[PDB]
Design a protein around this ligand. Sequence first.
Ligand SMILES: *[C@@H]1O[C@H](CO)[C@@H](O)[C@H](O)[C@H]1NC(C)=O
Ligand SMILES: *[C@H]1O[C@H](CO)[C@@H](O)[C@H](O)[C@H]1NC(C)=O
Ligand SMILES: [K+]
Length: 194
Amino acid sequence: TELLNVCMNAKHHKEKPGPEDKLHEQCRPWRKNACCSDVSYLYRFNWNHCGEMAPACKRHFIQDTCLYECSPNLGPWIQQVDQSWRKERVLNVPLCKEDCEQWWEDCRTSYTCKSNWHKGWNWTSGFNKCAVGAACQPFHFYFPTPTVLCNEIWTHSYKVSNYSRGSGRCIQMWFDPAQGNPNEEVARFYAAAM
Ligand SMILES: *[C@@H]1O[C@H](CO)[C@@H](O)[C@H](O)[C@H]1NC(C)=O
Ligand SMILES: *[C@H]1O[C@H](CO)[C@@H](O)[C@H](O)[C@H]1NC(C)=O
Ligand SMILES: [K+]
C-alpha cells in the first residue's frame, strides 16, 4: 500500500501528490493528481546538444519529463536507497512497447552524442553540452533499436515491456485524464506482484 500514489521530492522525502504546479502546466495528464506540485528537465536539460532536436522527437522528451516529475504511479520501481537523481531513482519501469517504438521512430531525424544521458555531460556553461570526444551522430547511432533507446537513455530507469497500452501491465508516458489514469491499475498490479 505504501507503494501506491506516492511521490519522492527533490529533497528525497516521500510526500503525497497534489494539484500540479505552474511550471508543469504543459504536463496536462497530471493536472489533478501530480508529484510536480525547481529541478525540472522541462528547461534544465539541453535537448539541442547536437543541433536543433526535431519537434516530433522533443514531444516525447517532454512526455518522459512529465512522467518522471509528475507521476504518482512509479512507487513499485522507486529505489529509495538511491538519492543521486534530481528526484526519484526508478529501476526497470515497464514502459509500454508502442510508447517506446513511437519514441524511437520520432527521433530518427534528430542527433545526439552519447547513449547514457544521466552522466558524462559538460556542465561548465550552466547547461549540459557534449564532452570533448563525444561525436554527434544520428540518433539511432547511439540508440539503434527502441530497446536501446528506452532502456539505456536514463540508465535502466525504463525496461521496455512486451505488453502494450490497455493491458494494465505497462506504464504509458501520456494519456487523456478525462478517461482516468491508466497507470494507476499498473502500479497496483506490480505492487501486488511484489
Ligand atoms: C568543458 O567545456 C569547455 C569547452 O567546451 C572546457 O573548458 C573543458 O575542456 C570541457 N570539458 C570537457 C572535457 O569536455
Ligand atoms: C510476455 O510477457 C510476459 C512474460 O513472459 C508473459 O507472461 C506475457 O503473456 C507476454 N505478453 C504478451 C501479451 O505478449
Ligand atoms: K501516471
